[PDB]
């Protein structure tokens, strides 16, 4: 739900994004900058500081997994709720993650793209990504809006 020209710039950019390390970085950064989200992942072992978190193989693995579904919804921009409906139910009904956190992961995602892509992360381009992250965030919030 993003004017054609907007899907174009976003999807086009997205091919240049190494999903594996953006994923890992994204998720580690979330757990460091927002220390309470750690509660959800304490099964990943040692998260006592940002070296243990950033190097923890299991955070690294989950990073790819998260951005893989992200990078999948990127192919269905007209139907976010559709795709993420299932993952909504996990996060909302089994995991009990508060929706404000989906928005926090989007924002950190944005920051990482910035870090990897320099002045190519143009202001106009970010605006589009901000629309991509709120969309995913709603999709995910779905299973109780």
């Amino acid at each position: 739900m993003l004017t054609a020209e907007e899907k174009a710039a976003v999807t086009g950019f997205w091919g240049k994004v190494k999903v594996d390390e953006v994923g890992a970085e994204a998720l580690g950064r979330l757990l460091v900058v927002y220390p309470w989200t750690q509660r959800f992942f304490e099964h990943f072992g040692d998260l006592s500081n940002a070296d243990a978190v950033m190097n923890n193989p299991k955070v690294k693995a989950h990073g790819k997994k998260v951005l893989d579904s992200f990078s999948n919804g990127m192919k269905h921009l007209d139907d976010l709720k559709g795709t993420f409906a299932q993952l909504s139910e996990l996060h909302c009904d089994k995991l009990h993650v508060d929706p404000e956190n989906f928005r926090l992961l989007g924002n950190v995602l944005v920051v990482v793209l910035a870090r990897h892509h320099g002045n190519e992360f143009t202001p106009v381009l970010q605006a589009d990504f901000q629309k991509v992250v709120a969309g995913v965030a709603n999709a995910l919030a779905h299973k109780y809006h």
């Binding site: 460091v32 920051v111 910035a114 990897h116 970010q126």
Partner: protein, 141 residues
């Protein structure tokens, strides 16, 4: 709430920003105005076109108030007390808007300092900027 480690990282990283604060401040505003259209109803007296002189000029002012903040970390409430008044009581700026500049600001610093923007520095800066925001929203009378 700002530990010793945080105080240093902000000091260190902002020192890294150096004579470029002005330019970054304008970049954070830009991406704010561009990502979050609501924020514009506060500057209907600005030319908000890319590259605007007014924006650049406001970039410095914001940048300068943050330098000043970075220098006087021990007493923020008293360093920025005037700003708290202007923004909260005189301009009536919604607090959520403070989350947003902070964010673009972090996107901007990430962009221009990739090698120095580590998880731990990110962490510290966020804490900094949330504090400057807390102070700015404190005087709600």
């Amino acid at each position: 709430v700002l530990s010793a480690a945080d105080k240093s990282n902000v000091k260190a990283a902002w020192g890294k920003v150096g004579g470029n604060a002005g330019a970054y401040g304008a970049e954070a505003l830009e991406r704010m105005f561009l990502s979050f259209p609501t924020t514009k109803t506060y500057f209907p007296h600005f030319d908000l076109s890319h590259g605007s002189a007014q924006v650049k000029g406001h970039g410095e002012k914001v940048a300068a108030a943050l330098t000043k903040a970075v220098g006087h970390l021990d007493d923020l409430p008293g360093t920025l007390s005037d700003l708290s008044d202007l923004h909260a009581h005189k301009l009536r700026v919604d607090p959520v808007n403070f989350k947003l500049l902070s964010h673009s600001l972090l996107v901007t610093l990430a962009c221009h300092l990739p090698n120095d923007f580590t998880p731990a520095v990110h962490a510290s800066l966020d804490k900094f900027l949330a504090n400057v925001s807390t102070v700015l929203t404190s005087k709600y009378r």
